Amino acid sequence: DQLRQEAEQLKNQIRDARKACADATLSQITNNIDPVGRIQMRTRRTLRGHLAKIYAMHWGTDSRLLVSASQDGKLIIWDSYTTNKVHAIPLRSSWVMTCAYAPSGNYVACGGLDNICSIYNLKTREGNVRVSRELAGHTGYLSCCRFLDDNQIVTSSGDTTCALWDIETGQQTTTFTGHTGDVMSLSLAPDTRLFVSGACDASAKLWDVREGMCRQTFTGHESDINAICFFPNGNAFATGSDDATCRLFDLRADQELMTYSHDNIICGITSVSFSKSGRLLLAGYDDFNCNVWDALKADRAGVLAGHDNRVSCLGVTDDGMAVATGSWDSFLKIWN
């Protein structure tokens, strides 16, 4: 064989170019930096009103608006300062797996097992919430709607491919293929020109939203990646598996910077979020509780433990003022 020999030596000698220039681990340098102690965060607000499991949640762009999508076919927009429900949207499918908020507060996208990413319009002339555009064209279940502008959004699916759509015409503007499993998550970059996606073949991959280019591939887990988010400066991204491992990969160093597992952990991570300073890498677990990990020393600097079922969604605001968590017991609890 010739191309198999060339591909084998390509992967092994590019890994050798990575290893020969790999100076040291992230902890070997940050070891002398002092820890942050125990971040005992308290439940300030306890949003109630959902009567089924809560599957996803997105903050507003003004650190006050909020969306929560539940299993009983309800999408609720919360005022998170007075615990008031701003809006309640009936959902064509009770099989809601993900939801998103527009960065201008105008639209809200929500989708799931019916392969259709619905996009709703809140700022109407009639005072109700009508469905603006149902993006259809996926062959399987949907995950991680993520708004770029009011006319642009990337949606992951179980068709081993993600898709950049165009809300005006309604077509699949850009198609990102290259996975060998069901892409469970994606997270938009803070500059909104790149994104990363994690799939059920134990491997993430950094994609460019402009050219549809497979820029980088990430590996290191043994099981599927269930959720993903970016370091707030857009140069590193931490994922969370069912391996009970959160991992931090650098987009430029091409390998995992460091692992965020503990031996006492029995079950896998469901959600991953970053504080605004990039110093508290939160992680919701299936053990009914989330762990706020110190993102430089990998020590659990606090445990948010108020839910009665498995944590399903985390969200830190744009200023970092709060941590909304949502679980299968129908309760979002804000922690400050």
Binding site: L10, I14, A17, R18, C21, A22, D23, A24, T25, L26, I29, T30, I33, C214, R215, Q216, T217, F231, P232, N233, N235, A236, L248, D250, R252, A253, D254, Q255, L257, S277, G278, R279, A295, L296
Partner: peptide, 20 residues
Amino acid sequence: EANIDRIKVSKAAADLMAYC
């Protein structure tokens, strides 16, 4: 993925400590 930016595990290590 052979011709990719090679800012390494200690070249970008001080980038995460600088942001946090």
